[PDB]
Paper text:
We isolated and characterized two Shigella podophages that have notably different features when compared with classical podophages and instead are most closely related to phage N4. We describe the isolation and characterization of phages Moo19 and B2, including whole-genome sequencing and analysis, cryo–electron microscopy (cryo-EM) structure determination, mass spectrometry, host range studies, and enzymatic assays of the tail proteins. Moo19 and B2 are similar to bacteriophage N4—these are all T = 9 podophages, which encapsidate their own polymerases—a hallmark of this phage family.
We also analyzed the data by imposing icosahedral symmetry to visualize the capsids at high resolution (3.6 and 3.4 Å for Moo19 and B2, respectively). Both capsids have a T = 9 geometry. Using DALI, both the major capsid proteins of Moo19 and B2 are most similar to Ralstonia phage GP4 (37), another T = 9 podophage with an RMSD (root mean square deviation) of 3.0 and 3.2 Å, respectively. The decoration proteins of both Moo19 and B2 bind the capsid proteins at the same quasi-sixfold symmetry axes in both phages but have notably different folds. It also forms a homotrimer but is quite unlike Hoc or gp28. To our knowledge, there are no reported phage structures that have structural homology to B2’s gp45. However, B2’s gp45 had poor alignment with these helical decoration proteins and did not share a recognizable topology.
Numbering used by the authors:
A (entry chain M), E (entry chain O): 5 to 48
B (entry chain G): 18 to 387
C (entry chain E): 50 to 146
D (entry chain E): 196 to 292
The structure:
């Protein structure tokens, strides 16, 4: 359920050109917001 | 060209409604929360009455403020009778209790999308009409199960054939736990104590040749599969028990989709009757019973009264539900940063459903047959 | 071309309504597009109800399918032949009729 | 053919078919008539007529209803010989086998 | 072409500000949906 996603803390966006919802995680957002190999979180 | 395209399409009919018509609505205010509460009162003598105020007539507290309760046993009532001596110091000290009923309202909805290309270059030019007809009909269908699922789940009167007590107990392996004529009359007897009133009056009898007279009964909703078992059902006198509908059609009025009557029940067949599929016992050597999905399939027999289904409508104007549709046709209406061309459409159906099951004395008896 | 093709539209909630346009209440893409199926079993169908929430969005997507029906037409015939000598010299004079 | 076997067609076929062509015949003021339910014309070869005639209901009574037992009550179909359960029996000279 | 994305079993998310279109992958989304080091695939 979508509320479980929000209650967990993860956000969500809308996939327009085919698909449903992808859910943004905290690490993923940091992973997603990386320019070079020295801007992504430590784990990855 | 290799074939001729016939225009008229084959469209499936909509399953006739059978449960939504029997419910009554209770309006729920907007500005306040999403729950409705009730205070059901119980009789003093009923065993449901539990209370701390219980001082014995000739003595101290005994933690029983219901006198003899509902014992109905001649070996008990005289002892617990409120006998009083000449000196009226203390007595039974009866108490009273009220029951809290809670009802919830949930949200459900649909949506589907289509591109302009699909509507334009399609073999059939009536695609839009077929989609909306199929969509709204399904919303009508889904609403029905919402009601029926709750009614099946909530039923105080749940009789089990034979010596069974739970769904897992039922099996067709040995002596198949099936509906007996003895079982059906007891459900009426249990229903005869109170709640469910007599849906219909007794049939006096009309001047004919084959017509028979039936007693006042209450509608019992049954799946199509179990109908055969009710048909070939021997009475105590080895005669028929399933009085056919035709044998009292002339005399009394008829309820929709009627097949017949047993004792204090008029049989009603519903095409869309949910069942406990694959919830019985493991089918090791299933003796040709249609009830087989991994395990034996359990079928219900439902008899709804007239005070056991309070459907709560949030803003529904005297209806079990309203459907709220939203059509965004492809074109300018759907032009945005996402699609700056507008080659997308959207239709969504939203609704609000909730039930209460007040006075839960509906009858739901199981059966594993066919 | 001796073939008549028809179009039968299945109901939405039938198991024949297999379509890829399926999104669940969690926003993911599911396989079964005909939600809740045709299965009249209350052991599963409560789970697959179109439960929306206050948030709303791209959840509970459904599709629609249609089926083709094709006919056919065949030729059939027969004949008989008689000789002149049969009719004139026959005992009956209404044999032709 | 068996009585439950015949009605097992009816219940399944009731779950889909076209309605009961004929209506439900009510009771008449006569002295020998019976009452038959709504039926759909069943077509049968004359060879099986005897089998239906000496047909036993589950309660060891007569199952076939001779058509004259509801002649005055309702309307008779062409070639009708009688009715069984939810089927009015229609005999056809040219039925196959 | 955008149709080639869907043919690859791939969904795509639009960008409001300056991207136009960002293609979103199921491994990426599963990577992207992650609170901490626990919820990333064995490949990472």
């Amino acid at each position: 359920d979508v509320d479980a996603i929000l209650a967990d803390g993860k956000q969500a966006v809308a996939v327009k050109h085919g698909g449903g919802l992808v859910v943004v995680g905290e690490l993923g957002a940091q992973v997603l917001a990386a320019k070079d190999v020295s801007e992504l979180p430590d784990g990855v | 060209r290799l074939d001729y395209y016939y225009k008229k399409a084959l469209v499936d009919a909509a399953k006739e409604m059978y449960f939504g018509q029997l419910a009554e609505v209770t309006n729920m205010p907007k500005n306040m929360g999403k729950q409705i509460k009730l205070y059901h009162y119980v009789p003093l003598l009923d065993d449901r009455n539990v209370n701390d105020q219980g001082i014995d007539a000739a003595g101290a507290t005994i933690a029983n403020g219901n006198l003899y309760g509902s014992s109905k046993d001649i070996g008990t009532i005289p002892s617990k009778l409120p006998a009083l001596t000449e000196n009226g110091g203390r007595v039974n000290r009866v108490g009273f209790t009220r029951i809290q009923l809670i009802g919830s309202i949930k949200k459900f909805g649909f949506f589907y999308e289509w591109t302009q290309e699909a509507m334009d270059f399609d073999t059939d030019e009536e695609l839009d009409s077929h989609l909306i007809q199929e969509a709204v009909k399904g919303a009508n269908e889904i609403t029905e199960d919402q009601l029926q699922i709750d009614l099946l789940n909530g039923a105080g009167v749940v009789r089990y054939p034979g010596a069974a007590t739970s769904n897992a107990d039922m099996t067709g392996e040995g002596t198949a736990t099936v509906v007996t004529y003895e079982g059906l009359v007891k459900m009426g007897i249990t229903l005869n104590d109170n709640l469910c009133p007599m849906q219909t009056k007794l049939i006096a009898g009309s001047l004919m040749t084959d017509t028979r007279t039936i007693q006042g009964a209450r509608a019992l909703y049954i799946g199509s599969e179990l109908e055969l078992q009710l048909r070939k059902m021997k009475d105590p006198f080895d005669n028929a028990a399933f009085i056919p509908v035709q044998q009292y059609a002339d005399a009394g009025n008829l309820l929709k989709g009627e097949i017949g009557s047993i004792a204090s029940f008029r049989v009603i067949v519903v095409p869309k009757m949910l069942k406990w599929a694959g919830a019985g016992a493991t089918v090791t050597t299933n003796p040709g019973y249609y009830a087989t999905s991994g395990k034996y399939d359990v079928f219900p027999m439902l008899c709804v009264g007239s005070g056991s289904f309070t459907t709560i409508g949030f803003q529904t104007d005297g209806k079990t539900v309203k459907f709220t549709t939203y059509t965004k046709k492809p074109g300018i209406e759907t032009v945005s940063y996402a699609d700056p061309y507008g080659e997308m459409g959207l239709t969504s159906i939203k609704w609000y459903y909730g039930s209460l099951i007040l006075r839960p004395e509906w009858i739901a008896l199981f059966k594993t047959v066919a």
